Design a protein around this ligand. Sequence first.
Ligand SMILES: Nc1ncnc2c1ncn2[C@@H]1O[C@H](COP(=O)(O)OP(=O)(O)OC[C@H]2O[C@H](O)[C@H](O)[C@@H]2O)[C@@H](O)[C@H]1O
Length: 166
Amino acid sequence: NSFSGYLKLTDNVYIKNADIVEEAKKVKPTVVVNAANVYLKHGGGVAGALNKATNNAMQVESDDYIATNGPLKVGGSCVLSGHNLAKHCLHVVGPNVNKGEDIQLLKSAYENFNQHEVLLAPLLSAGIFGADPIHSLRVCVDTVRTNVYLAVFDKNLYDKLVSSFL
Ligand SMILES: Nc1ncnc2c1ncn2[C@@H]1O[C@H](COP(=O)(O)OP(=O)(O)OC[C@H]2O[C@H](O)[C@H](O)[C@@H]2O)[C@@H](O)[C@H]1O
């Protein structure tokens, strides 16, 4: 695969200090993961950046998905187009711990990754949703069995994560 410069964490999990949008643009992976909310309203963080890079096509598609199917579940997912970034985007909803949602649902969220052989992904719930980032990384490592390439935008966070036990 064309993923380059990743640090190996485990047999199947790799990590890099990179913007997921730039990784997706360069690699054009089969699957890029979005850290979504249940309404697929891609406002900020990973979702807002991915959507911006698609010139809002991701949001237009997402609005039709919701109109047809209704909100996702917390811990749930749907497969939509990856537009100009990837073949597919797997939109995954981690728990919004800052709004009282159960952190246990982070494991359910990462289980969705096992339906795909290779993914480029962020650390779910670790941003605006308020989960401890090292916890999200540990849940990823302990849940995902398929090959995951994690893109960590924030340099300070990356440096801390790669120096922490799993
Ligand atoms: N471009 C990026 N590339 C890689 N990692 C990033 C990027 N931007 C942020 N991160 C990191 O990615 C991690 C996740 O941060 P978040 O994207 O907030 O996701 P969540 O699951 O916590 O919140 C979901 C909400 O965020 C959106 O508003 C949605 O629309 C949802 O409403 C953090 O470590 C970030 O530093």
